């Protein structure tokens, strides 16, 4: 039906819900960019990915959308997207009468390296990481009514909007699904003084290190 080149290669796509709820279109994330280029005569709206203010990371290293979820509501619709640094940003699609007005981004919270995100009903956010225990937070703040700024696609820059990260202000950790993942090594022996041998299993990824001394029982 349609073919549309882009400026640079992309990494992920997210379908903006259309019909009676929201407009049609597909927001494509790419290296240090997020572009909303819907169908028809709608124009392309761009928004660069923020970065941490005075971040010690490498400048040559870009940023890509690791994963994204959408909270579809009858009133409006927002998206929660995790970056390579785990900073979960809140994308809002400023829509005109019949076209896209601008892409409103805001620092939602700081989350781990996110492999998947599901925004369920009753204000719950299940964030599963590529390594380490899972996470299930309680969506308390809706992203607004705070002192955090909203970077919009209409806001020019030349230069990227530096991000002011902070702890979990809009989410509360309700539980943590252990799920001991990458077991780099293992030693099954009676390292303790007991007869029931313990399984010393190391798993993690850098800061997520954990030397779990597994024991066959129930806590």
């Amino acid at each position: 039906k349609y073919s549309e080149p882009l400026e640079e290669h992309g990494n992920f796509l997210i379908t903006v819900p259309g019909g009676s709820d929201g407009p049609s279109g597909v927001l494509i994330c790419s290296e240090n960019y997020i572009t909303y280029k819907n169908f028809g005569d709608q124009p392309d709206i761009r928004c660069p990915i923020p970065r941490r203010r005075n971040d010690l990371d490498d400048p040559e290293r870009g940023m890509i959308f690791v994963c994204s979820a959408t909270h579809k509501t009858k009133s409006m619709f927002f998206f929660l997207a995790q970056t390579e640094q785990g900073d979960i940003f809140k994308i809002t699609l400023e829509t005109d009468e019949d076209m896209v007005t601008e892409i409103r981004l805001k620092y939602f919270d700081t989350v781990p390296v996110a492999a998947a995100m599901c925004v369920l009903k009753t204000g719950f956010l299940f964030v599963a990481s590529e390594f380490g225990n899972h996470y299930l937070y309680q969506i308390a703040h809706l992203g607004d009514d705070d002192e955090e700024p909203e970077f919009s696609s209409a806001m020019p820059l030349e230069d990227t909007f530096f991000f002011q990260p902070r702890p979990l202000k809009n989410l509360v950790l309700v539980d943590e699904l252990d799920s001991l993942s990458p077991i780099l090594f293992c030693q099954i022996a009676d390292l303790a003084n007991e007869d029931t041998p313990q399984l010393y299993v190391a798993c993690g990824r850098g800061p997520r290190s954990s030397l779990r001394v597994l024991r066959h029982g129930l806590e």
Partner: protein, 79 residues
Amino acid sequence: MTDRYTIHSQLEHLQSKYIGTGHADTTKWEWLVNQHRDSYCSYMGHFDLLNYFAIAENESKARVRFNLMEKMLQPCGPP
């Protein structure tokens, strides 16, 4: 445009339509490119293989996915 090169089909021969089926006049660059592409696709397929390959670097799963999808075009070199 006097070329006279109408390579479509002759008598319904074998004509390997599979991607990477292999042939007789396959140069070393062709076999190497097919092998590299198949290996990249396999690394993109196996979840545990992706975890073991990306667990080396500090990059995330999406980092490895993008680096693999980017290396698909011209992995070996321009023949």
